[PDB]
Amino acid sequence: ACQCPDAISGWTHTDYQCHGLEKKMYRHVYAICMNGSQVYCRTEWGSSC
Ligand SMILES: [Br-]
Ligand SMILES: [Br-]
Ligand SMILES: [Br-]
Ligand SMILES: [Br-]
To answer: Residue 28 in contact with residue 48, Cβ under 8 Å?
Structure first.
């Protein structure tokens, strides 16, 4: 869930970290907009930790 005013130009994601409460891997996916701004798209979840 993310949208740029005009268009998405780029894609990036933060490092997987250990969720202290959920006990699973998580990281944040970010879109880069044409205007330079970044938007939080989705949280990705992985294996137990
Ligand atoms: Br998404
Ligand atoms: Br844009
Ligand atoms: Br990346
Ligand atoms: Br990673």
So the answer is: no
